[PDB]
């Protein structure tokens, strides 16, 4: 009943409970009132900054993410790799490709503000109708799937706590060799 209780509380210790490293998206109340333990920001002078600046319920994070605005996203990758950050706000498929690059970079579960990347264009111009028709012609065929095959689709043990116990077992065997030789000298 001792070893059954020990099996029960090790299953309590490493199966059910979990250190909540996840954020569960923008609706985390601990990030609504952040601190020095929650270092998170975005790219300096982006559309996401203005999108959070218009919304009055995202002002407090706007008072926080303004403290560490970065120039490029690779700066954010190097910062969160060197533990200078704790969370980063970015779009989906770029972070999916970088998760295919680096396995430690793990995204979250929620998904909001389903926006779109296009082509920045001028005013009334002859490069408006024909260009959009060319984009739609690229949409209708299998060229978008080929573009996904270029970069989007193309991706790149039980020794937790008893490993030290196993090492102490091996050291106890090594010391027990000399103890048994002392017992041989005893009789």
């Amino acid at each position: 009943i001792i070893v059954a209780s020990y099996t029960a509380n090790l299953a309590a210790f490493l199966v059910l409970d979990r250190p909540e490293e996840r954020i569960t998206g923008i609706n985390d109340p601990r990030l609504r009132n952040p601190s020095d333990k929650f270092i998170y920001a975005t790219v300096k002078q982006s559309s996401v900054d203005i999108y959070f600046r218009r919304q009055v319920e995202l002002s407090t994070m706007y008072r926080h993410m303004e403290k560490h605005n970065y120039e490029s996203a690779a700066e954010a990758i190097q910062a969160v790799r060197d533990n200078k950050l704790h969370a980063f706000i970015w779009d989906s498929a770029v972070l999916e490709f970088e998760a295919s690059q680096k396995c430690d970079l793990v995204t979250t579960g929620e998904l909001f503000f389903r926006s779109g990347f296009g082509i920045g264009m001028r005013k009334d111009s002859p490069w408006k109708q024909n260009v959009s028709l060319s984009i739609l012609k690229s949409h209708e065929n299998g060229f978008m799937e080929d573009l996904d095959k270029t970069w989007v689709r193309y991706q790149e043990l039980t020794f937790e706590n008893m490993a030290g116990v196993f090492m102490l077992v091996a050291g106890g065997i090594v010391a027990g060799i000399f103890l048994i030789f002392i017992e041989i000298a005893y009789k």
Binding site: E71, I77, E98, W127, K149, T150
Partner: protein, 49 residues
């Protein structure tokens, strides 16, 4: 007929490589034998700081 094209250095989308010998590129293949048709762009090394 000539259209000015400008972009930002996106990490999975805009790959920038230095020239091999003199204003040239390295014609490499993908995993399916497709040669990456590069382009000769002009840009700075880093930002103003």
């Amino acid at each position: 007929t000539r259209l000015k094209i400008v972009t930002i250095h996106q990490e999975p989308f805009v790959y920038v490589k230095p020239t091999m010998s003199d204003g040239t590129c390295k014609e490499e293949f993908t995993v399916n034998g497709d040669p990456v048709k590069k382009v000769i762009c002009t840009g700075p090394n880093d930002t103003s700081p």
